[PDB]
């Protein structure tokens, strides 16, 4: 019985930085993840998160 | 719990109705309040497949232009992926040996793709025959099924199929 997360629920519009929306969605998924103690989704999307924040760093050079 | 853990894709235009199939496969329903994907989305779910439990790792991506960046960073990785147009959008499915290239490319030559020729509940609208797309898919070697994320057909059996073929040659 599987797991979908919403998407960054009922809030801001999307970012003008389309790496920086993404952030924000994993973050968000995280913090359902975290909620609904799937530590397996926590660690896949943080390990995400990483290179997510990794990769816009990198873009700011 | 799960023997086997595939990353999954789901890739295409804008529109073709990605999202409605990530939601119609782990909810069971069609998606009543859809927008353009904001990046990429993630589910999560566990099927039995070829007498294993397999756990799918499915990033949902973006379709819009403005986020090809951040959705090609998603393939790397990627063992299976559902390439998506709509049956009712002709600039959708031209779309397909882009979206082709570039995830055989950034994910392995081995990457297992299933062609979903999605919203064919919508016959009447129907812009790619099925015959068209059989040979497409064909020539490229693709799986292929037409698909519905509002009725649910052969959504489920869409990830099934591709589960089993990246398991068993
Ligand atoms: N009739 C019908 N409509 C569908 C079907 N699948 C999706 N739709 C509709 O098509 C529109 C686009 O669906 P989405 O799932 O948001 O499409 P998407 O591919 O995720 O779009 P992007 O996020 O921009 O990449 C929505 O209005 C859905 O209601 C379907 O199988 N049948
Ligand atoms: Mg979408």
Redesign the interface.
């Given at each position: 019985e599987?797991?979908?997360?919403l998407?960054?629920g009922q809030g801001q519009s999307?970012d003008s930085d389309?790496?920086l929306?993404?952030i924000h969605?994993?973050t968000s998924?995280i913090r359902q993840a975290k909620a609904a103690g799937?530590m397996?989704?926590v660690r896949?999307?943080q390990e995400?998160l990483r290179?997510?924040q990794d990769?816009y760093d990198q873009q700011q050079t | 719990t799960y023997d086997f853990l595939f990353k999954f894709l789901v890739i295409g235009n804008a529109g073709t109705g990605k999202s409605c199939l990530?939601?119609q496969?782990?909810?069971k329903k069609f998606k009543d309040d859809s927008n353009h994907?904001?990046?990429?989305?993630?589910?999560?779910?566990?099927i039995n497949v070829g007498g294993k439990y397999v756990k799918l790792?499915i990033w949902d991506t973006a379709g819009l232009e403005?986020?090809r960046?951040?959705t090609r960073?998603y393939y790397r990785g990627a063992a299976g992926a559902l390439l998506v147009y709509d049956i009712t959008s002709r600039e959708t499915y031209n779309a397909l040996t882009n979206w082709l290239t570039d995830a055989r490319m950034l994910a392995s030559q081995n990457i297992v793709i299933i062609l979903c020729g999605n919203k064919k509940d919508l016959d009447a609208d129907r812009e790619v025959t099925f015959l068209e797309a059989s040979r497409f898919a064909q020539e490229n070697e693709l799986m292929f099924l037409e698909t519905s994320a509002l009725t649910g057909e052969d959504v489920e059996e869409a990830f099934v199929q591709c589960a089993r073929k990246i398991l068993n040659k």
């Open positions: 599987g797991w979908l997360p998407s960054g999307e389309p790496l929306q993404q969605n994993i998924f799937r397996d989704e896949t999307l995400n290179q997510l990769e | 990530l939601h496969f782990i909810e994907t904001i990046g990429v989305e993630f589910g999560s779910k566990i790792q403005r986020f960046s951040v960073s």
